[PDB]
Design a binder for this molecule. Structure first.
Ligand SMILES: NC(=O)c1ccc[n+]([C@@H]2O[C@H](COP(=O)([O-])OP(=O)(O)OC[C@H]3O[C@@H](n4cnc5c(N)ncnc54)[C@H](OP(=O)(O)O)[C@@H]3O)[C@@H](O)[C@H]2O)c1
Ligand SMILES: NC(=O)c1ccc[n+]([C@@H]2O[C@H](COP(=O)([O-])OP(=O)(O)OC[C@H]3O[C@@H](n4cnc5c(N)ncnc54)[C@H](OP(=O)(O)O)[C@@H]3O)[C@@H](O)[C@H]2O)c1
Ligand SMILES: [Fe+3]
Ligand SMILES: [Fe+3]
Lengths: 400, 398
C-alpha cells in the first residue's frame, strides 16, 4: 500500500512580508516604491488609534507623499454593506490601491474592496459564483492580529447581512503586494482573541493534515507548526506581552494558510470551516470559537475514514504511543481538552447556542453548499462528503 | 535565547511540481509572453533519459523558438557562461531556459544577467557590477540539491583565476521552475547523496548561525530528519518516487528563504571553504561539505553550545547535556555522512593534507575578492581567520 504519496502541486505566493518590531513606518515606503500615490485606508473600530498603529501609519504615508481617504468601522465578522460603502469611495476618489490596517476582518474587507473597485456590478457576485475575480487594485496591509493568514493569501470571507450568508472567495488577484506584521502591536489583544486566533491557525493546518494525504515532509512541517502554536498560546495566556510568543505565533499563522501546508496534499477538507461560517453568520461568534466547537466533533465523526493520520496526530502532536481506535480517541480527547484548558468553547452550550437551533444552522450550511460551493465544483468535506444528516449529527455531537 | 529576528520574506518564483509536468514548460513560457529562448544544458544526461525530448516537444507544441548551448560542467565555468551570453545576445533571446541540475540553472542565471550587461558578467562576482536586471529565467530541474530553482543565487568558477564565487540578486529568481522528481531515478547514487548533503548543509548554515527561534528550529529539524530518511531509502531504491519527491521539496525549501526567517543571515563558512575545494580539485559541492561541515562543527561548538545540544536531541534523539551530548551529535552527523558514502576527510577525497596551505590561500582570496566588497565575512558565530581555516582543514584531513 501507498498511503504517503506526495501529490503534484503548483506553488506560487508573490506576497512580500515585512516582519518585526518597528516595521510599520515602512508602509509608506513600500507603497511609494510600488508606484502608488493615493490609497483607501481601511480600518476597524479604532483599536489602531488607541494603540498608536494609526499614527505610525499616517506619519509614514505623510513622510512618503502618499495621499489617502479613510473608511472605518469594519466589524470583526466583516459585512458586505461596509464593503459596498468602501467600493463607492474607492471608485469616486479614484484610489490606486487599498491599505487595510487591522485584523483579518479588515484585510479581507480590503481585498473585497480592491476587487469591487474594478467591477461594474455588486462584488457579492464573486461569493456566489457569478463573477471570477481576475483583477483587483493592489492591496497593502498592516496586520494587527494573527489568526487567519489573510496577510499572505488570496482568500476573503464576507457576510451578506441581508441573507445571513458568510462566504469565501479565493483569487490570485487578492494576494497582498506587501504585508507588514509587527507582533508587538498584539500585546493589547484580549486573551480570548489571542486564543481564537491560535485555534484558527491550528485549524487551517488540520484542514490540510486530515484531507486524506500524508506526505512525510508536509506532515513534519504541519506537526512542528501545530506544536509551536500550542506552546505559544499557553505562554501568551500567562504573559500577553511575551514578544517571542507573539512573533512565533504570528509566523505560524502566516504559514498555516500561505500555501505551505497545501503542498503535496489534496486541497484540504474545509468541512469544519464551512460549518463554522454558518455559526458566525447566525450568531456573530468568533471564527476560532466556532472552530473549537466543531473541529473535535467532526474528528470524532470522521476518523474511521482516515485512521492512520488520526493515529499520527496522537503520536506527533501529543506524544502518545499505541495503535488503533484507542490511540485515535486519546488524541482527539487531548485536543478537546487543550482547547478547554486555554478557555475556548468546546460545545454549542458553552457558546450559548441552544440545541433546538441545530436544524436552523443545518439549513444555513446547506444553503452555503448550494450557493457558494456548488458553483465552483466544491463539496462539503473530502475524506467524507457531508450531507445534511451528517452535519446534523456533528452538531449533535458538539451540542453539549 | 530564542529571539525571532526581524525579516523580509519575498519569493515570487512559481513552482510546478510532480510527475508528468515537464510538458508544461512551453505553456509557461508562452503565457509569460515569451517566444524565443536560449535552451542551456549540461553534458548530455538529458538526451539519454527523455528530458530533452519532453522539453523540445513542449516548445514545438507551444510555438516557442529556441537556440541551444550545451556542455555546462558540474562545477560550472565562466567560459561557458561567456559563450552562452554571446549566443543570447546574437540571437536576441527573450529568456533563458536551463534544463539540468544546479550547475545548469546557475549558469542560466548568470547568462540571463550577462545578456543585459555590456561588460564581463564576472564583474558581478567580484563586486564590480550590481545585477539589478536580467532576462527572464525558466528551468526544468533534473537533480535536487541546491535549491537554485527557487532562489536568486548563482555560483560560477572562473577557471583562469581558480575562483569559485557566488552572487545573489532578486533579478535571478526564476519565473517558473518545473520539478519532475521522477527524472532523477537515473542519478548515480553518489550524486543523490551529494545532493542530500547540500540540502542538509543549507539548513544547517542557518540553524547554527547563532539564532534559535522555535518555529524556525522545528521546520529545520523536520526537514533534516526527512532528508536523512529519504536519502537512505534512495540508496536502496533509486526509483522510489515518494523519496525523490520528499527530498526534492526539502531541497527547495532549504534555500528558498524558509530557513532564513527569524535568523541572522546564516553562517556560510562551510560553504565558502568548500568553494575552494571545488575550485582547486573540482570535487562535487556536497562531497566537500561532507568533509568540511563536521570539522567546522567540532571547531566552533563552544560558540553556540545550546543549538548543538538541540541538534543532538532533535535530529538523533540523544539524551543528556553539555559537551558529551554536543559531541555525540556531531559524531553522529559525521558517521551518518560516512554511512551514506560521502567523504568525511580530505583523504577520502584524494586531497593531500600537505595542500592545506594552498587551499587556505584560495579561501583568503575569496574573502578579499568576493566577500569584502559586499560587506560580508567568513563565519558569524566565529569569524574565521586564516589560522582558523587551517585548523578546520587539519581536523578534516584524516
Ligand atoms: N482570508 C482568510 O485566509 C480567512 C481564513 C479564515 C478566516 N477568515 C476570516 O477572518 C475574520 C477573523 O479575523 P481575525 O481573527 O484576524 O480577527 P478580527 O475579526 O479582524 O478582529 C477581532 C477583534 O480583535 C480586535 N483587534 C485587532 N487587532 C488588535 C490589537 N492588536 N489590539 C487589541 N485588539 C485588536 C478587533 O478590534 P478593532 O476593530 O478595534 O481593531 C476585533 O474586535 C473572520 O471573518 C474569518 O471568517 C479569513
Ligand atoms: N544557486 C544556489 O542556491 C547554490 C547553492 C549552493 C551550491 N550551488 C552550486 O550548484 C552546483 C551543483 O549543482 P547540483 O548539485 O544540482 O549538481 P550538478 O553539478 O548540476 O550535476 C551533477 C551531475 O549530475 C548529473 N545529472 C543531473 N541530473 C541528472 C539526472 N536526472 N540523471 C542522471 N544524471 C543527472 C549531471 O550530468 P549532466 O551534466 O550530463 O546532465 C552532473 O554530472 C555547484 O556549482 C554548487 O556550487 C548553488
Ligand atoms: Fe479559519
Ligand atoms: Fe550548497
Amino acid at each position: 500500500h501507498h498511503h504517503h504519496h506526495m501529490e503534484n502541486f503548483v506553488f506560487h505566493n508573490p506576497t512580500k512580508i515585512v516582519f518585526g518590531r518597528g516595521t510599520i513606518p515602512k508602509i509608506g515606503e513600500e507603497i511609494k516604491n510600488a508606484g502608488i500615490r493615493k490609497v483607501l485606508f481601511l480600518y476597524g473600530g479604532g483599536s489602531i488609534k488607541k494603540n498608536g498603529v494609526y499614527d505610525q501609519v499616517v506619519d509614514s504615508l505623510k513622510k512618503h507623499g502618499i495621499e489617502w481617504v479613510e473608511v472605518s468601522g469594519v466589524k470583526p465578522n466583516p459585512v458586505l454593506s461596509k464593503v459596498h460603502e468602501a467600493v463607492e469611495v474607492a471608485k469616486k476618489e479614484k484610489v490606486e490601491a487599498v491599505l487595510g490596517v487591522g485584523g483579518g476582518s479588515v484585510v479581507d474587507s480590503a481585498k473585497a474592496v480592491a476587487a469591487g473597485a474594478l467591477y461594474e456590478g455588486d462584488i457579492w457576485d464573486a461569493f456566489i459564483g457569478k463573477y471570477q475575480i481576475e483583477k483587483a487594485l493592489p492591496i497593502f496591509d498592516v496586520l494587527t492580529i494573527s489568526a487567519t493568514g489573510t496577510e499572505m493569501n488570496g482568500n476573503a470571507v464576507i457576510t451578506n447581512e441581508k441573507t445571513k450568508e458568510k462566504y469565501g472567495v479565493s483569487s490570485k488577484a487578492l494576494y497582498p503586494k506587501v504585508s507588514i506584521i509587527d507582533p508587538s502591536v498584539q500585546f493589547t489583544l484580549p486573551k480570548e482573541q489571542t486564543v481564537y486566533g491560535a485555534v484558527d491557525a491550528i485549524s487551517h493546518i488540520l484542514e490540510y493534515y486530515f484531507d486524506g494525504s500524508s506526505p512525510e515532509i508536509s506532515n513534519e512541517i504541519a506537526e512542528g507548526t501545530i506544536r509551536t502554536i500550542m506552546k505559544m498560546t499557553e505562554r501568551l495566556i500567562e504573559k500577553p506581552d511575551d514578544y517571542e510568543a507573539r512573533a512565533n505565533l504570528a509566523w505560524s499563522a502566516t504559514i498555516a494558510l500561505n500555501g505551505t501546508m497545501a503542498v503535496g496534499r489534496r486541497g484540504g477538507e474545509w468541512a469544519c470551516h464551512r460549518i463554522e461560517h454558518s455559526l458566525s453568520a447566525l450568531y456573530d461568534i468568533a471564527h476560532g470559537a466556532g472552530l473549537a466547537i466543531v473541529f473535535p466533533a467532526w474528528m470524532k465523526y470522521v476518523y474511521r475514514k482516515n485512521p492512520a493520520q488520526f493515529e499520527r496526530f496522537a503520536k506527533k502532536i501529543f506524544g502518545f504511543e499505541g495503535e488503533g481506535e484507542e490511540l485515535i480517541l486519546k488524541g482527539i480527547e487531548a485536543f478537546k481538552n487543550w482547547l478547554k484548558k486555554v478557555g475556548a468553547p468546546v460545545s454549542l452550550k458553552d457558546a450559548g447556542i441552544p440545541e433546538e437551533d441545530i436544524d436552523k444552522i443545518v439549513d444555513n450550511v446547506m444553503l452555503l453548499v448550494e450557493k457558494n460551493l456548488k458553483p465552483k465544483g466544491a463539496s462539503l468535506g473530502r475524506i467524507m462528503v457531508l450531507e445534511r444528516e451528517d452535519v446534523r449529527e456533528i452538531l449533535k455531537l458538539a451540542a453539549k
